[PDB]
Symmetry: C2
Subunit: 364 residues, 2 copies
């Protein structure tokens, strides 16, 4: 009796160990449980001293048989867990690989965005300048019209005043854009503010209207010249656009496709996380979709960016990874399922044995 106590108590050493080898699956966990077992089939052997029923009746046969059976499966249950962890380690490693690639992809998208903007800006500038001169043309014209339309010097001076700020504004806006071949035009735009200003401050007098009329006429001349200069810039803008437009269109198409790809790469990282954190076939197939999505994006890019080195390298890095992961994911789903079922039955075995051995003690 004090020996059945010994067995039941020694068995509890096994129960614990096994639970640890299953809750956890440390290597020491295993050894611990394997030692607990050998010493238990020792203790359970000394109990074998007592005999009652022999072949006709022997429950403890069941336990010693069990204990022997379970001990055989320990190492295989460890390689199962040890193998599942290796697949999960690799999945994490490959997601780091993909993240690294997505980074280069993003750097490239940025490069491409910059390159578009730079090219799109050549004509933008040309057209900004075209408008400057056309605003100057339009201004000088408004001045000549409204001043020369004023009858008295009082109102001619009034009108000039209203427009006097714009005269310097216009000069600063167009100074650098001024055709260097022209020289009187230069004189007009720069001298204008001082002259007209002075006339405004100076009290109505002899020749104040002469001077006004002179600049009303220098402005009309300038207006037509600046209009021509503007159309000069416009013609430029159209040549330079037309000659970059292909390049730009082509890059916006690549850059769009790059952003698309980078997005699907992030969709992988998300789906993979769900997979790793709930490793069913369900999550596997969701992750598989995200994979095919990246595969599309890459073939799409492959057409517009065939020969674009970065894309060649990106596909060279990406696709072998995805291929490995598609298979690795299947493997992991499987090993994970085996691990859980075997770890289930294993625990079941450690409960049939307790049930059985509680038995003998019930029998006393």
């Amino acid at each position: 009796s004090n020996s059945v106590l010994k067995t039941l108590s020694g068995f509890k050493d096994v129960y614990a160990q096994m639970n640890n080898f299953l809750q956890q699956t440390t290597d020491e966990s295993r050894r611990m449980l394997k030692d607990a077992i050998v010493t238990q089939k020792e203790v359970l052997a000394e109990t074998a001293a007592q005999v009652a029923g022999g072949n006709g009746e022997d429950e403890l046969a069941a336990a010693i048989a069990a204990t022997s059976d379970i001990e055989t499966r320990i190492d295989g249950l460890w390689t199962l867990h040890e193998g599942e962890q290796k697949l999960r380690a690799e999945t994490r490693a490959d997601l780091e690989r993909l993240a690294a690639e997505q980074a280069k992809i993003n750097e490239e998208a940025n490069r491409l965005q910059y390159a578009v903007r730079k090219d799109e800006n050549a004509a933008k500038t040309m057209l900004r300048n075209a408008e400057k001169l056309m605003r100057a043309s339009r201004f000088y014209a408004e001045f000549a019209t409204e001043v020369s339309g004023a009858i008295t010097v009082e109102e001619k001076l009034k009108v000039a005043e209203g427009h006097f700020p714009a005269i310097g504004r216009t000069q600063r806006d167009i100074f650098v854009l001024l055709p260097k071949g022209e020289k009187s035009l230069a004189e007009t735009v720069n001298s204008a503010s001082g002259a007209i200003g002075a006339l405004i401050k100076t009290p109505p007098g002899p020749e104040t209207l002469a001077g006004l009329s002179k600049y009303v006429d220098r402005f009309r001349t300038a207006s037509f010249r600046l209009e021509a200069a503007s159309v000069g810039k416009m013609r430029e803008a159209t040549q330079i656009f037309s000659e970059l437009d292909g390049k730009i269109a082509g890059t916006e198409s690549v850059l769009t496709a790059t952003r698309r790809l980078s997005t699907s790469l992030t969709d992988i990282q998300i789906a993979a996380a769900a997979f790793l954190g709930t490793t069913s076939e369900e999550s596997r197939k969701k992750l598989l979709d995200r994979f095919l999505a990246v595969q599309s994006n890459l073939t799409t890019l492959r057409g517009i960016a065939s020969g674009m080195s970065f894309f060649d390298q990106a596909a060279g890095a990406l696709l072998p990874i995805i291929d490995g992961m598609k298979k690795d994911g299947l493997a992991l789903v499987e090993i994970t399922d085996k691990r859980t079922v075997e770890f289930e039955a294993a625990g079941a075995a450690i409960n049939e044995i307790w049930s059985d051995l509680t038995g003998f003690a019930e029998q006393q």
Copy 2:
């Protein structure tokens, strides 16, 4: 003696339970261990029957004292774990909240990208058409020059042939762009391919050169008209650009800032994951950086997009989340540290007691 066996064996029931309440921290785990304890201080009480040394000498005092002490801490160690899990649940919940917002942010960035392109395309089209007419102008001119420069009908026909494909190409390219006010111009561009073609096929004859000379002259006229039309389109392009350029610049600035923000939102999701998966103060402070980065991005956007509803709502949703999480993260670091230390000492207590109680058995 058979009672010390009872205690040591009953204690092993406790050892296991406790380990489960610590490896795991299920509610049933707790109850299990709390039941294992009450019955152990029962069994350890019957052993109290034996007395040896009394106050002068009593190790089992140590165990029964222990067992009493540990039992008191169980529930507090559970609320510690129960509280740590609540913080981790909320962290995950708030990351879902942020992800949801990042989505709206991305939809908006897309909206804005579309809106730029649409606006940037008004002038692009105008300039594409401007170049079409200027290519047509240039073509008709090349034809008049090279044909009319040819002396004999043989080479006049030769030259026309070379240029004959372009005549229809040009017609299709510019047809819709043709100023409807003009009517002879219409006649020339459309009639051209047929007439010139016919002249080419028809064998050199009387009036073949007359007909050529007629179209050489209709082409020069058309050339100057198309050049004017082109400059018409150009002028349009410059007005329409200049009148959208502010809108476009402003949107590219918002869209850039939106993409920037969305990026920092992803940086949070990453840092948070590292935090959750290694919940040290170190990872907390890294996540804190990602938070401040988002906070910047939002104030930046707040200036360019002040009044942009979507941004008002985004900041209204984002910032309270980040605030909660900054504090929640501190809390979690703390509770997590307490949990681990207390769960450590708890296990230590279940080892001093085994050491002590192994003792009495050593004493026998």
